[PDB]
Amino acid sequence: ECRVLSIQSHVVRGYVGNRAATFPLQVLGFEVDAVNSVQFSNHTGYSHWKGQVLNSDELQELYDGLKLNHVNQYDYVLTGYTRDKSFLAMVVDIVQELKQQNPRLVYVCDPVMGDQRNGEGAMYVPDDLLPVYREKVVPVADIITPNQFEAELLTGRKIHSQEEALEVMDMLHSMGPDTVVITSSNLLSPRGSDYLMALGSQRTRAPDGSVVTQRIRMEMHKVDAVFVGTGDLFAAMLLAWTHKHPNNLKVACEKTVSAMHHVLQRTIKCAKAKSGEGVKPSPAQLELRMVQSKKDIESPEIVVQATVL
Ligand SMILES: CC[C@H](CO)Nc1nc(N(C)Cc2ccccc2)c2ncn(C(C)C)c2n1
């Protein structure tokens, strides 16, 4: 039995934030407790959107409810896209007290702040969130899944190669997270302009306090569409696989990214099968075919090989 506390957004239609993390973790055998940080008709990639957001105090209300009935015991805490700095400071308090109620509680954090386009990245969230993620959040994170744009901001050091990209990660580990994964970066992969490159190193503390920093590289064949929520579906499954492979980041990212590709391919197909030739598919048709990728989520056919080091 493994109980995860997933504090992310919810949407009536589509798979983003919690909608993107729940079903996977559930079919992967996990016990998902979901706090919906917001509830909107759909993600903001759409033309329109309406909805309500959960504030800082309401997040707490729900936590006290859990605490009062003495059911605030968890094995994992998964947080993602957040706009409110007060809401995030609240997430840190919760995570710190949950780590006191004691389990080898693993805090999987996706430091969502924006994405990267070659020279400068467009920040999604307000810049008053960076300090908090850097100063209060990451320090208590165990597994963080940033962008390259995110890894950079977090360390205040920009990335221009695989080499200095591992230097940013080493810098990250120092802040607290023993596991880091750069889910996507500008870096040209040894496979061509056609492949996206993911990076990630695990600084394991083996018996007798030795150092162990296994680093890896993943190459996912890109896809002709702009998907929403892939970051969320990723961190969720990563959570799942790193549980199965606690010291084998290699196999965890493999299974993770492999299932990633299976769902994205199945998605881009139905989006196309649902859109005439010459017309670009809509955020609506690009929604992940989640329910359909069940088995693939359950048992990912390894079509990717993690390059050790
Ligand atoms: C930031 C950009 C995107 C749009 O492409 N919109 C969006 N919108 C989201 N929405 C669904 C939540 C939401 C709705 C209204 C205001 C704030 C947050 C959302 N939840 C997780 N994610 C990403 C990080 C996978 C979400 N992304």
CATH of the domain at 86: 3.40.1190.20
Technique of determination: X-ray
What is d(CA 109, CA 97) in angstroms, rounded to the nearest whole number? 16
Lining residues, ligand 1, CB within 6 Å: 9, 11, 16-17, 38, 40, 43-45, 49, 51, 81, 83, 112, 124, 228-229, 231-232
What is the residue-wise DSSP string for 165-231? HHHHHHHHHHHS-SEEEE---SS--TT-TTEEEEEEEEEE--TTT--EEEEEEEEEE--SS--SSHH
- Ligand 1 centroid to 262 CA: how many Å? 23
Is 147 one of the annotated binding-site residues?
yes
Note down the domain range covering 256: 1-309
Annotated active-site residue 64? The verdict is no
Is 44 one of the annotated binding-site residues?
yes
Based on the structure, what is the number of domains in the chain? 1
Mutate to test the pocket of ligand 1, among 8, 9, 55, 226 (most ligand atoms within 8 A of CB): 9
What is d(CA 27, CA 303) in angstroms, rounded to the nearest whole number? 21
Is 223 one of the annotated binding-site residues?
yes
The alpha carbon of residue 177 and the mean position of all alpha carbons in its chain are separated, in whole angstroms, by 14
What is d(CA 238, CA 20) in angstroms, rounded to the nearest whole number? 13
Q: Whose CA is nearest to atom 11 of ligand 1?
A: 43
Q: Whose CA is nearest to atom 20 of ligand 1?
A: 17
What is d(CA 300, CA 119) in angstroms, rounded to the nearest whole number? 34
Resolution of the coordinates in A? 2.7
Token readout for 119 is 């020279």
What is d(CA 72, CA 50) in angstroms, rounded to the nearest whole number? 31
Q: Is the dihedral of CA 259, 80, 111, 43 positive or negative?
A: positive
Q: Whose CA is nearest to atom 9 of ligand 1?
A: 43
What is d(CA 127, CA 18) in angstroms, rounded to the nearest whole number? 24
- Ligand 1 centroid to 167 CA: how many Å? 30
The single-letter DSSP state of residue 134 is I
CB 97 within 8 A of CB 119: no
What is d(CA 189, CA 194) in angstroms, rounded to the nearest whole number? 9
Pairing outcome for strands 31-40 and 3-11 = parallel
CB 144 within 8 A of CB 180: yes
CB 91 within 8 A of CB 79: yes
Q: Which helix (H) or strand (E) holds 308?
A: strand 307-308
Is 80 one of the annotated binding-site residues?
no
What is d(CA 186, CA 120) in angstroms, rounded to the nearest whole number? 11
Count CA atoms closer than 13 A to 83's CA, side-chain side.
8
What is the residue-wise DSSP string for 29-55? T-EEEEEEEEEESS-TTSS---EEE--
- Ligand 1 centroid to 36 CA: how many Å? 13
- Ligand 1 centroid to 14 CA: how many Å? 11
Per-residue exposure over 82-98, b if at least 16 CB sit within 10 Å of its own CB, e if not:
bebbebbebbbebbeeb
Q: What angle do CA 191, 196, 200 make, to 5 degrees?
A: 100
CB 257 within 8 A of CB 242: no
Tell me which amino acid residue 266 is. Answer: R
What is d(CA 64, CA 66) in angstroms, rounded to the nearest whole number? 5
